[PDB]
């Protein structure tokens, strides 16, 4: 039930790196979790900050 | 509460759900729920190891979705440590979101423009590229094939221009996905 | 009509004040839209005929078309004594700009000239028309006699008084930029209080503008 | 003289009239004074090169149809100059093929007709070189001519260039 | 395009040519080192103008080589291509990568990506050519082409052509 | 959309460099960056889906009016009135004949706008501008 709630994006849960075992569930106050594709995620990852006070 | 606070909370939630993993979502949602949150507070709520929150907090600070305070107090047992507080700076965070998505759009335009100049060629033996401008310095005496300057091998065709429509489609799929971000 | 309205929409997207003649407006409209003055002069009549034989039940959508036809006929048949003012800001207090287009009649004698051409005997009359020689110049008409009567009274029935300062000799004025001056507002309030105490039945207080009255009454209540 | 690196500059493009810092409109000659940049059309270049070759043949001695023109300039070339004349032979052949005007009076008429316009030397040499027909074709062949010459003036000057075209 | 420019060259004379006709030897080495020589700074230099009066000043002896260095200033006709410039020419070679057009002393290679899509290679023809629905481009064919790219080395210049714009192509 | 360029998918908000470039043959909300990316190398077909008209780079211009139909109507009106410029002086004061000429001009402008008789009206326009 936690699983289909997770792909329904109704709850938030973290899983272990060895296996996808739910241990602690929260409420998804935001929207759906898979809106942004993974290559856009890395494409977002590709950029960085020069400094602080200019912006 | 305040409607602009609701909008910036949903914007931070959307960007952490989109460009970041589930543990990042949990940490930033905890920051948005409890306004300030120390390291033991994140540990108590999320059951997350110090080494596990390491990359999470490092990424969130390097993107300025959360910021840190280095205040130490004086507890009655006098076992004081320089604890750290994690909270959110709303204007710096939203300005970081604008700058990141804006310049991401900018060099996506740069990448599709670089695709939009014609493809040129590349030598499979030496794994070096040679555009059309300098391939004509490397054409043969038979005036048929471009020969490599080092390998002396006929140049093969690249694919910078066959994927221009694919890059345009990827740009479109980025934009319709980030429409809530621009509306916020 | 649609291309005229679109030309008006293009004309209102100007970030500064335009003060232009109807002849210049017609020349610009002709060079950018190919609309002449003569088809514009029949615009209201043509719209009325078209609406009549369309026999429409609802005209709430066509009220703005009446506005456009009225504007077109006015700015087409009138070129001297009129002026078009395009303002990027209708009000300066608003955050978002709201453009406005005003076709204004600068000559008050234009609307009254056919009256004096038609009627032989006109008696311009007012209780408080002064100065009398201003009006035969300001409106182009000739007057056979202009006079103001002095009322004969056994006792002086009315007391006109000009108060230039408060009770404590602080000067009083109603110019719009110092309307928030506490001394002047307090002096006006004290004046109104004393006059309300010593006036038996009624008392009418006239203010230079509604915004001035709103501000000074609100801070009087404060 | 300043010693800045000044490595940033715009790419040399014919449409923007950027021909490089040493193909500017003013050129300091060997006598020291400034002079307008001498830009030649194809027929003008052919006549200047032929005049130089016959003057050099005169100096060496003292010290028309396409078929006869090609052999005459070939004998002139081999009589005048010595080695490494592949490039010069190709220029001579190219100019005698694509030479719009034959003689000095017609070509000088082209220079004075284009100097009546008061236009850029690159642009007038392009007009004298390209065998254009219409004004819009001239504008799309030379993007440098945009917002420079009116359409009626362009079409008439190309009309008498078409009239001056011979053989 | 063809230009006329003031040019200066440092030329080296071997000591064997230190005779009474050293100026004549200087002018002849100016000829067979400048005429037809390609430089990327000043374009293809074709012919030397004003041969009767060529500016030759005093020539410095090199302190180790022993040869004389003359800074000769002269007038010459040059040919420098530029990006975005329309020139006419004739095709001299064809291939599946493209075809070269001969303008002046320079071969401009037009790639196969820079023709209209109706125009296709035909290697079965002798010579191999490019054929379309309305025209054919072969060897020794008059053709108008726009140069949209130029590379210039110290001693070589190569250009890229395209005929995808309207009112270009064969004449 | 009236705010963003659908071809390059850029909002006016984050990218203020987009402009209201259209073409007389097909009126498309397309930006200057898209125009310079596509049509600078050569003429091409309309990048918006469902349209494949050939069009040139030098024919692009900015749209004056907000309505596409009004913009194309005034452009067609210009393309008619450039060769049709008879006035009351050309008709020698014949007011009814001048009115009938204005009727014919508005008829052919409406026909070119709606494409109902585009071939015959184009033929008539050509054989009347040849004189
Ligand atoms: Zn290689
Ligand atoms: Zn665009
Ligand atoms: Zn289209």
XYZ file of C-alpha atoms and ligand atoms in Angstrom, chain B residues 122-128 130 147-153 155, ligand 1:
17
model
C 35.622 13.198 -37.043
C 38.422 10.656 -37.385
C 37.595 7.304 -35.725
C 41.255 6.252 -35.437
C 42.522 9.323 -33.567
C 39.121 10.243 -32.003
C 39.523 13.914 -32.964
C 37.542 18.309 -37.722
C 42.200 12.514 -45.070
C 43.252 12.937 -41.446
C 46.358 14.998 -40.716
C 47.845 12.305 -38.445
C 46.097 8.998 -39.193
C 45.765 9.606 -42.979
C 42.301 8.027 -42.807
C 37.021 11.292 -42.462
Zn 42.899 10.731 -37.275
